[PDB]
Amino acid sequence: IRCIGVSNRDFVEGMSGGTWVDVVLEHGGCVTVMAQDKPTVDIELVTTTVSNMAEVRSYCYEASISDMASDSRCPTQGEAYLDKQSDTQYVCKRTLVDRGWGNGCGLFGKGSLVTCAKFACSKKMTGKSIQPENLEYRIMLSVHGSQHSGMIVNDTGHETDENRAKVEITPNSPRAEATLGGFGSLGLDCEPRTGLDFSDLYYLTMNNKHWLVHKEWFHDIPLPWHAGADTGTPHWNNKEALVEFKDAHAKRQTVVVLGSQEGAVHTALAGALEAEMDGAKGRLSSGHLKCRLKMDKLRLKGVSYSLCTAAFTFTKIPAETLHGTVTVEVQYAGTDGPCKVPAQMAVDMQTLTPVGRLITANPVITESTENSKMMLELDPPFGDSYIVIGVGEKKITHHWHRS
């Protein structure tokens, strides 16, 4: 019953007797599978996680300069060099500077000058790789097993709960039989590669917000980068795209940093597919998982139960789902449980032919003593109609209209 209230639902109607039902699972969407003498099953794809992603590249968007200097030589007096030129963590520019008798050099001509400064990337971003071997889906299913109340949409426990199971699926071994001991087993042979796509993309993380980028876009970025995953003060390649030299005079080429580049990339990411991490792994949002579950060993619980006799009570006001169906919570007061709930819909009301079909097929009461509560979902016919809960005297009728 984990799908009551879903915006993007799919009323997938199965085949009477047949074990073949084709279901497509979109993220944020669920599928209610109703069939012949078998319980109706809610099916939802909750998570599309990825496995270890290796850090392929890492660019820089906020640098910090330090320890700069400028050595200058006189014209025709040698090539100017510094004490820390060959250090890789230092960016340097060797240009010419006009000299003369005013600066100190005894010749009138252009001279040498070299300016160096230590590079240290403050804020950097990382780009990772994704493989089809890495992704791992996660499907949760919950049967309309005549569950009490509405707050039966909580994953607390569940391990000790039937009619509701979790299955994990991998492209390598996507078999993943779903066990629900009260109602039997439920096979599900699912096929990946419907998720479009994973051909050649990257998982880009900058500060804490992640996206999925292309190959040559992420390759073509004018920012410092290094291809290693080392945290040991590694050498940054292409340090010139963030460090600028302007207007040297005689002994100091004014160095200027090009500032931060976070929002600069954010303007270049308007339209890219977003992403979300999961602590260590990463989540996806495309989904569209085509699947085909076989319901052979599914068994309907509650057929031997004999139609309840005492009176029900409306526990909460029935409401109309956005699709048209109506949810009802009723409350039985009697030790005659377990027993099948006598709920139906009729327009004549006397007596007593049914019009609409149920959604929670063959609704029961789990507990026996003493005053239990249970949930219901019906598909009323179009137009005005009555809903009837209970049998004989003390039964409850209610007016209803659809669309």
Partner: antibody, heavy 119, light 109 residues
Framework: EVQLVQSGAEVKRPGESLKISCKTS????????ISWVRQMPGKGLEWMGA????????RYSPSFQGQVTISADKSISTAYLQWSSLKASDSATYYC????????????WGRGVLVTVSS | SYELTQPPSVSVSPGQTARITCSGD??????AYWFQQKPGQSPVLIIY???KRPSGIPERFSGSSSGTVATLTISGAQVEDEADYYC???????????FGGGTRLTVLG
């Protein structure tokens, strides 16, 4: 906004080990260099050494290289200046200074720590 | 060894121009930084890059480095400027520090 809180006054004896500290708060500690300056009583300023906390890169003056040890724990944003064998001639006021963008460009000064060493 | 040479004492009458000289060899190729230190207080930056004045410093403190000599100019000296004055620079390599001997100023008002 920048705050370079130095250690408290220290009185030691000749031979004892000592480590003075310069705790920083208010700027990017792993970006700017950290320099130390010694000033003996009645004497002038003497630059001892500098250190980059990004990789603990150290530059020592030839008059002090081999007699002091400069370290820094960038995790807590604090510089250090320690002596293994304290001489009697080491009694002075010590300043920690956050450098600027240029090499050895002194930008922010501390309040100075008083080091007294007598037998 | 390498030291910067400063005149030990310099005197100036109130309202006149006090001049302080810092002698160096690599100063034609490196910059200088003028600091002022009062008794008990820590040093303050007076001049950086040999010609620029920071904020919070009065407009009278000027400076200029010419060839092998740096010069600190104090136009309109006052009795509150009586303190110690140091220069500072880098060695020929530019990665080590160099402090001058000092110039204790004296105002006779």
């Amino acid at each position: 906004e920048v705050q370079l809180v130095q250690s408290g006054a220290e009185v030691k004896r000749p031979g004892e080990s000592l480590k003075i500290s310069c705790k920083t708060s208010g700027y990017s500690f792993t970006s700017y260099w950290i320099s130390w300056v010694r000033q003996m009583p009645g004497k002038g300023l003497e630059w001892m050494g500098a250190i980059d906390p990004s990789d603990s890169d150290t530059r020592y003056s030839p008059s002090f290289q081999g007699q002091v040890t400069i370290s820094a724990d960038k995790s807590i944003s604090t510089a250090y200046l320690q002596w293994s064998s304290l001489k009697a001639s080491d009694s002075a006021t010590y300043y920690c200074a956050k450098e600027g963008i240029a090499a050895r460009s002194l930008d922010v000064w501390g309040r100075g720590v008083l080091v007294t060493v007598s037998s | 060894s390498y030291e910067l040479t400063q005149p030990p004492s310099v005197s100036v009458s109130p309202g006149q121009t006090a001049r302080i000289t810092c002698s160096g060899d690599a100063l034609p190729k490196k910059y200088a930084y003028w600091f002022q230190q009062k008794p008990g207080q820590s040093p303050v930056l007076i001049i950086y890059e040999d010609s620029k004045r920071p904020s919070g410093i009065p407009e009278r403190f000027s400076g200029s480095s010419s060839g092998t000599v740096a010069t600190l100019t104090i136009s309109g000296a006052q009795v509150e400027d009586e303190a110690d004055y140091y220069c500072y620079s880098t060695d020929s390599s530019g990665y080590h520090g160099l402090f001058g001997g000092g110039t204790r100023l004296t105002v006779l008002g």
